[PDB]
Amino acid sequence: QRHVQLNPELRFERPDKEYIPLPPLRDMQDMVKVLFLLSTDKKRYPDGRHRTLDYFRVAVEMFVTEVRQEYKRQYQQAQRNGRAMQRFTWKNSGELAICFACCCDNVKLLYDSLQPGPLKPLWDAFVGQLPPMLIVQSRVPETMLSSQTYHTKYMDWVKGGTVRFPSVADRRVKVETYLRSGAGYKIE
């Protein structure tokens, strides 16, 4: 469904070393939908089959939860003060940023786990599919939070790799904890 099936023992049907087979790849429309299909087609790609995919799905779920909560908070704050919310404010050091970094970390791992082939999208094209998927799942209007803003935040993540922001390992524990227990923690 929308939510990832919990996996307390972190057990997967296929080994971590195995490549994930690609969805149908014949044409350009197939190519742009690869990430969306990996993410959402639980008939072809059930929860619990591939560790890399489940981790990515969890990161997405956590991000979507946070962006929706933050959007609602900002919208209500604007309303209480008699003003129209003009744009979503994306802070670079909080829970949203952390969740987005999880998405980026795991979309990279997912990309590397996908079966190579002549029609496998290039990395830039593949990671370019991430904002549209987050937009649709979040239901946050693009007039409030644009693909261009996502691009900026992606660039920030690229730069941070090459404050007391969680490391890659910290972020993986965050994802694993959620997958095991359904438990998320935002520092307050």
Residues that bind a second copy (CB under 8 A): 17, 19, 32, 83-84, 86, 108, 111-112, 115-118, 120, 122-123, 125, 128-129, 131-132, 135-136, 139, 141-143, 146-148, 161-162
Partner interacting with residue 78 (select from Cl ion, a second copy, none; CB below 5-8 Å by kind): none
According to DSSP, the residues that pair with 20 across neighbouring strands are 114
Single out the segment in contact with Cl ion by CB under 5 A; choices: 43-51, 72-80, 108-116, 152-160: 152-160
CA gyration radius, the chain: 17
Q: Which of 76, 89, 93, 152 binds Cl ion (CB under 5 A)?
A: 152
Write down the least CB distance from residue 27 to a second copy, Å: 13
Q: CB-wise, 169 or 187, nearer to a second copy? A: 169
Which residue lies nearer to a second copy by CB, 119 or 183?
119
**Which DSSP string do the residues of 40-51 spell out, in sequence order?**
H-TTTS-TTS-H
| 147 binding Cl ion? (CB under 5 A) | no
Least separation in angstroms between CB 159 and a second copy: 11
Q: Which stretch binds Cl ion (CB under 5 A): 61-69, 85-93, 151-159, 172-180?
A: 151-159
Evaluate the CA torsion angle 53, 54, 56, 57 in order and state its sign.
positive
Cα angle vertex 154, ends 151, 156, to 5°?
Answer: 115
The token pair at 60 is: 């997405």
Instruction: Give the closest residue to 52 by CA, choosing from 6, 94, 14.
Output: 14
Q: Which is nearer to a second copy, 5 or 115 (CB)?
A: 115
What is the distance between the alpha carbons of residues 124 and 7, in angstroms, rounded to a whole number? 31
d(CA 150, CA 136): 13
Interface residues with Cl ion (CB under 5 A) are 149, 152
